[PDB]
Symmetry: C2
Subunit: 415 residues, 2 copies
């Protein structure tokens, strides 16, 4: 009894981030094969990958080396400028009146229905990326779940999140009484991983200069599509994905998959959320690339493939230098703010200290947004890479440092 | 039979580096108390500390919290602009014709004589600082020892070096057949430490905003002045200094004292090199500060002591920001050069790889100087802090990367 809904979100754009949209398109195809209806699956994807000038298979997206297209048939619900945090919240709430642009499809669910949410891109401590120069903050995502729960618009929900430090979106803040179960690609202090990368094994087709997928994402999808979901439980998928994402417990090239929320949902059969493919009647180490370094890997691939063209080669090398200089500006400015506020030798211990598991990243989420606002007003936009510094901003909030002191430090560091 | 000579060198200047000149002045006083004659001890010190506007005891320098002046009576052999690598080499060779400025005092020693060399400041892999915008390279220092040995101008020599990564000045290149024994404050991959720092224990007098000494340096000096050097061997001093510099084998706040050269000299009584004080008839953990961060600690002390003066406080905070921005420029530019030459993900492993103990830092020392020259021509002067990147430059040389490729990478990184 009830209807199965899904919300699939890629939080990034650019050919360098092909894998996030490939993960989301693969999830869409898997859910349709399971019997979920298109009207109940909302897709958020920037939609700049299939027809990108750099795509060697125009109009096609693949998510693993087998090369099966996952782009054909995916709906354009929220693409381009409409991939926003506000539209994501309106969609989850089932409030078409709060949607701006897009198809108008929302999760206008009933109390008997189940919902599956999958996000891929990206992130930082307490934050997720959204592609139109937006940061999605953890407490706002939890508040949307609380609002949806208070309306009575679903029976249970399962949420899968692929992003760096993704455990920090739920630690200390995700309630267990919302009928929502969550898993994350990593704990609160680990990065997440791209996989099926050029120059690595398992290798994507040779024409690819960008990674095809993300480790935790392809782990759950390849697990669902290789099992009878009427028999596999939510717990069994969690255990399998945790094992695969750990990469033979080698955490220098793997992460700790975490679980939050209502763990009673782990006893449920996965088909209640992902459907079941009627045609299904029921492992080696993977080379991975840090999510934050996959863009530089892609630019280096473009550089190495243009070695015969001097002009193009020089242009790409200068783009790599601009990208590293921008990364260095953000990393150096945040380190400098720590020194100005706390002194040398205490700056890094304060900004980089990780709270114990189970504690929220920040006590005041409005303060966290204000630290980002003050930083950006003097130092420039944070960018997706800059989300790595969200624990530094949270730690400034937690330390008792004033917003007036942050303003002074940012002005000295970046004016 | 024979005369005891010494060469004492501080490689730095500025009130932030008070400790290097305080170590050298203390060494001078200790040697005079031992019966070495002033005409046989050459002092290299910039000489900007005793009368510095920031010195709370004008005309006085102290090297430990007991506060005994060590400045009065120290000769001005090579000070200011004359503290150069060329003068140091001429002095060690005993060649007054090759000295420029200074007092003209040199080590014009005889075959029966012994020599003691002590250097304090900082350094980097394969390099030592000199204060007039100069880097002293390890192979040139070894070549001066070989030239002095070839002339027959001494019986034995002992050399003590306090600087970061100082073991790298001798690993793989110091011969055992020159009648020279050497110890260093650290191994080839560790920093060295300032001690007697403000805000730490054992604490210097409260008027001091800069560290009074360096750990290995005060370890040997305080050991020599508390023992009968006619009974203590060179080996006993090495063992005591190794124990103290390790700081209870806590290498997060200590270093590994290393030995090189002719270890047969360790059996000799220390008075043969340092003299003996006729009035001498024969341990707790020390708080330390990284040599490369002591300047920022001093600037933070000045900032915290000027909190009542808004104008002065703001000025110091901007000086701290300029210093950290300069550090970030050097660190970021070297990291960017690694990415441009080797690609992302291989850049840091190549630039930061440490050769096995016993191997020279670089196979071609002229290439090492050329990498520094190319870097500086595009990215600016390395500065003393920038000597930390000498292993990256050595690794560029060792990798087979051409000087033409280094030029291209530096131009892209810094133009």
């Amino acid at each position: 009894v009830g209807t199965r809904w899904a919300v699939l979100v890629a939080g990034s754009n650019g050919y360098e981030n092909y894998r996030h949209q490939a993960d989301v398109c693969h999830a869409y195809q898997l859910l349709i094969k399971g019997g979920l209806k298109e009207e109940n699956i909302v897709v958020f994807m920037y939609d700049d990958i299939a027809w990108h000038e750099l795509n060697p298979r125009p109009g096609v997206i693949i998510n693993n080396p087998r090369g099966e297209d996952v782009y054909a048939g995916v709906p354009k619900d929220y693409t381009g400028e409409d991939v926003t945090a506000e539209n994501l919240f309106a969609v989850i709430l089932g409030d078409r009146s709060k949607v701006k642009g897009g198809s108008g499809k929302v999760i206008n669910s009933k109390p008997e229905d189940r919902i599956f949410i999958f996000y891929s891109n990206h992130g930082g401590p307490g934050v997720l990326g959204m592609p139109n120069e937006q940061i999605l903050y953890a407490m706002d995502f939890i508040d949307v779940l609380k609002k949806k729960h208070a309306s009575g618009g679903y029976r249970e929900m399962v949420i899968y999140v692929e992003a760096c430090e993704s455990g920090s979106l739920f630690e200390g803040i995700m309630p267990k009484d919302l009928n929502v179960f969550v898993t994350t690609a990593s704990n609160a202090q680990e990065n997440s991983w791209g996989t099926y990368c050029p120059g690595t094994e398992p290798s994507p087709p040779p024409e690819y200069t960008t990674c095809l997928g993300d480790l935790y994402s392809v782990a759950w999808m390849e697990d669902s599509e290789s099992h009878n979901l009427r028999r596999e439980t939510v717990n069994q998928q969690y255990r399998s994905v945790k094992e695969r994402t750990s990469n033979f417990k080698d955490y220098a090239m793997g992460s700790h998959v975490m679980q939050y929320g209502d763990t009673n949902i782990t006893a449920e059969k996965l088909y209640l959320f992902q459907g079941f493919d009627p045609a299904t009647v029921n492992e080696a180490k993977m080379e991975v690339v840090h999510q934050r370094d996959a863009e530089l890997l892609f630019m280096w691939q473009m550089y190495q493939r243009s070695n015969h063209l001097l002009g193009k080669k020089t242009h790409i090398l200068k783009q790599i230098a601009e990208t590293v200089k921008h990364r260095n500006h953000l990393d150096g400015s945040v380190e400098l703010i720590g020194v100005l506020l706390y002194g040398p030798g205490k700056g890094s211990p304060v900004l980089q200290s990780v709270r114990d598991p189970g504690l929220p990243l920040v006590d005041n989420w409005a303060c966290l947004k204000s630290m980002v606002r003050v930083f950006e007003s003097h130092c420039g936009s944070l960018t997706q890479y800059g989300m790595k510094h969200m624990r530094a901003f949270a730690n400034i909030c937690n330390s008792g440092v004033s917003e007036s002191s942050m303003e002074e430090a940012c002005m000295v560091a970046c004016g």
